[PDB]
Amino acid sequence: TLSILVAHDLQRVIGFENQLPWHLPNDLKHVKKLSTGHTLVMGRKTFESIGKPLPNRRNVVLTSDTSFNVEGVDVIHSIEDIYQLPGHVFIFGGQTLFEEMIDKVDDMYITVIEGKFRGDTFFPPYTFEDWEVASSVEGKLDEKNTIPHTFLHLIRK
Ligand SMILES: NC(=O)C1=CN([C@H]2O[C@H](COP(=O)(O)OP(=O)(O)OC[C@H]3O[C@@H](n4cnc5c(N)ncnc54)[C@H](OP(=O)(O)O)[C@@H]3O)[C@@H](O)[C@H]2O)C=CC1
Ligand SMILES: CCc1nc(N)nc(N)c1C#C[C@H](C)c1cc(OC)cc(-c2ccncc2)c1
DSSP states (O other), X not given: OEEEEEEEOTTOEXXXXXXXXXXXXXXXXXXXXXXXXXXXXXXXXXXXXXXXXXXXXXXXXXXXOTTOOXXXXXXXXXGXXXXXXXXXXXXXXXXXXXXXXXXXXXXXXXXXXXXXXXXSEEOOOOOGGGEEEEEEEEOOOOSSOOSOEEEEEEEEO
């Protein structure tokens, strides 16, 4: 199973100056439940922006740097190596790798942030004519989650 896993705002912003533009604890928990025990694949810049591999799952970084090495991180140098990864594989970021993978994945787990943030990194355009809405769940607002958001699982028609 090959999935995209992304949070993006109303204009598909996913990042600003190496940071997430929003603070949404419920989405981090969403990320944890989906991807714990499985595989996250990310381009080099997305990994560096995070700074450490995420615990309790395989962390795979795509880069052309043959000296890249980080404890707890498996390195690949080719898009085609993604297809040899066993198990459930989530494409995690960033804009470049999403552009390379959006036409290849089976499904996408999107968190739509119902806001307009300043961004410099974007998720590719996509149309619902190509994706069936398997589920759409509104996140709950509270104390620490103050931006409306929606969990979409989209599956390729
Ligand atoms: N929500 C998110 O995902 C967030 C992520 N970002 C990041 O995304 C922003 C935009 O950068 P980006 O390019 O989208 O990030 P990215 O896609 O995570 O990193 C791109 C890098 O991945 C490597 N790469 C990609 N395709 C490859 C291929 N076919 N073969 C070999 N290596 C390949 C290469 O690393 P190289 O070979 O150069 O070492 C390239 O420069 C950056 O400012 C980051 O901070 C921003 C903040 C939040
Ligand atoms: C969660 C946000 C998020 N949600 C969803 N549904 N999919 C995603 N692909 C990401 C994401 C992301 C990027 C890689 C990111 C950037 C970052 O820049 C600091 C910190 C984190 C991060 C810090 C702590 N724990 C998990 C992830 C993630």
